[PDB]
Amino acid sequence: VSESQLKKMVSKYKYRDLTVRETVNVITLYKDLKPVLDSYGTGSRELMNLTGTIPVPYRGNTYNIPICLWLLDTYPYNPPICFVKPTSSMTIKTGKHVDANGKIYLPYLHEWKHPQSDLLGLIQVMIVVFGDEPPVFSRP
């Protein structure tokens, strides 16, 4: 996805260059995260989200944890809405940082404030937190 393609996806966003800038930073460092424009809740509510996996080390090995980061049209002033997206080979683990719907809860999202808070910082936190408590486990 080129910068031009990203600009199109966020046409209705309030802070476009800022959203594109960070998205590029994210997909450049985390190559398995892909920007996708999809409807959220309502067919007319299209938002861009970063969907894919992030590398997380746990008890010895690295796992490609499936996530989805929805960027609201107010990004970066408001935090993204994040979810763990389990595949058929795994099961989501409800716990401290993951609720019944797979929504992620983190102090980083709770006190989110631009410009110090950003997606690179968020993903870094996820790698540390999920490395301690995986949000998904492979089926037996």
């Binding site: 490609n64 499936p66 486990f137 492979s138």
Partner: peptide
């Protein structure tokens, strides 16, 4: 590439 998760525990 392919999503993976640690063994059930």
């Amino acid at each position: 590439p392919e999503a993976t998760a640690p063994p059930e525990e």
